[PDB]
């Protein structure tokens, strides 16, 4: 009745966090052990392993620390007060049983690179798109991640917001089936790799990316058509469609990739024909094809 604020010491937050995940093991614990099944040297005693994580978290808050590297230590979720890590420029969370990232990713405002690997992660928070300093985002072996958040970037005025500094996006062995339309808004994206994922479709606006030089879609066995170029002037130099086993067609206007230097079609066993105007690709463009297409 006579209230007229406070803040739990991080060490108390971390002790509560350890006791919590030590008691409540659903989902994360088997995922963390599975991800590390070929690593018998990691700490697998649950309390000790969570304590190791807590200690690394506490260390990362100190000045000096540029990077938080969590490899094979358990981190089901970040403890509260994640804003303590706002100064970090690099973060890796690998084989950690990571189930979810903080809803307010703005708390990691300093990040220039983020790598998430071998986690049961099902979604990325929408606020991940507020990381304006993020240059590289890498997600590998996160089979339960089925969608990217949106918008990834937006454009007014013509002014740009969101992941405006992102240069490289890698999504390998994920459950992602399609990309947000806003992918085409990433003004600084130079390299897009989506590998071994059920990517089912790709829109032609991907060719409107102003700086995209490399598109690597290898092992996307659900992809059945590659989209037309149309008016797209993306300065694409490398197009890797290796082992897209169900790819049936390339567009007829594929020759509009006037800067193409490498086209890799090996393992495209269902690609019935090449476009006739594939002779119109640049002379010094290395084209690799499966045997059934070599004659053409
Ligand atoms: Cl560095
Ligand atoms: Cl800045
Ligand atoms: Cl979107």
Strands of the sheet containing 191-195, edge to edge, are 67-71, 90-94, 113-117, 136-142, 168-174, 191-195, 214-216, 238-240, 262-264, 286-288
d(CA 16, CA 175): 33
SS3 193: strand
Instruction: Identify the CA nearest to 140 among candidates 224, 233, 71.
Output: 71
- The ligand whose atoms approach the alpha carbon of 69 most closely is 1
Distance 183 CA to ligand 3 centre (A): 7
Ligand nearest to the CA of 113: 1
Q: What's the 77 CA to ligand 3 centre distance in angstroms? A: 26
56 vs 34, 83, 121, 202, CA distance in Å? 22, 16, 21, 40
Domain that holds residue 128: 1-296
Can you give the length of the chain in residues?
296
Residues in CB range of 116: below 8 A, 6 or more apart: 92, 93, 94, 98, 138, 139, 140, 142
132 three-class SS = coil
Determine the Cα–Cα distance for residues 238 and 245; give it in Å rounded to an integer. 19
The residues, any chain, with a CB within 8 Å of residue 45's CB and separated by 6 or more, are none
Local structure of 133: helix, strand or coil: coil
Q: How far is the CA of 174 from the centre of ligand 1 (A)?
A: 27
Q: Which residues surround ligand 3, an ion (CB under 5 A)?
A: 150-151, 180-182
* CATH label of the domain that carries residue 94: 3.80.10.10
CA–CA–CA angle 116, 122, 128 (5° rounding)? 60
Tell whether omega for the bond before 127 is within 30 degrees of 0, i.e. cis. no
Q: What is the DSSP letter of 150?
A: S
DSSP-based helix, strand, coil % in the chain, nearest 5:
25, 20, 60
- Å from CA of 110 to ligand 3 middle: 24
Ligand nearest to the CA of 109: 2
Please give the distance, rounded to the nearest whole angstrom, from the Cα atom of residue 192 to the centre of ligand 1.
22
CA angle 106, 116, 70 (to 5 degrees): 90
Closest CA to 176 of 202, 146, 148, 149: 146
Domain count of the fold of the chain: 1
Max alpha carbon distance in the chain (Å)? Answer: 86
Which residues make beta-bridge pairs with 249? 225
């Amino acid at each position: 009745l006579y209230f007229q604020t406070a803040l739990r010491p991080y060490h108390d937050v971390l002790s509560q966090w350890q006791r919590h995940y030590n008691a409540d093991r659903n989902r994360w614990h088997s995922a963390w052990r599975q991800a590390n099944s070929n690593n018998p040297q990691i700490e697998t005693r649950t309390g000790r392993a969570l304590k190791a994580t807590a200690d690394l978290l506490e260390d990362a808050t100190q000045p000096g620390r540029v990077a938080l590297e969590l490899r094979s230590v358990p981190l089901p979720q970040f403890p509260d007060q994640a804003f303590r890590l706002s100064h970090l420029q690099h973060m890796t969370i690998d084989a950690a049983g990571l189930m979810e990232l903080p809803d307010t990713m703005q708390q990691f405002a300093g990040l220039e690179t983020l790598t998430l690997a071998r986690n049961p992660l099902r979604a990325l928070p929408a606020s991940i798109a507020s990381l304006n300093r993020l240059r590289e985002l890498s997600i590998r072996a996160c089979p339960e991640l089925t969608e990217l958040p949106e918008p990834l970037a937006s454009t007014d005025s013509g002014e740009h917001q969101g992941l405006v500094n992102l240069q490289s996006l890698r999504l390998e062995w994920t459950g992602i089936r399609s990309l947000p339309a806003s992918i085409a808004n990433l003004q600084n994206l130079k390299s897009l790799k989506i590998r071994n994922s059920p990517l089912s479709a790709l829109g032609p606006a991907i060719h409107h990316l102003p700086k995209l030089e490399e598109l690597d879609l290898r092992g996307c066995t659900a992809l059945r058509n590659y989209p037309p170029i149309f008016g797209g002037r993306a300065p694409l130099k490398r197009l890797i469609l290796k082992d897209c086993s169900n790819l049936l067609t390339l567009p007829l206007d594929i020759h509009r990739l006037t800067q193409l230097e490498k086209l890799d079609l090996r393992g495209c066993v269902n690609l019935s024909r090449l476009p006739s105007l594939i002779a119109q690709l640049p002379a010094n463009c290395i084209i690799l094809v499966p045997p059934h297409l070599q004659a053409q």
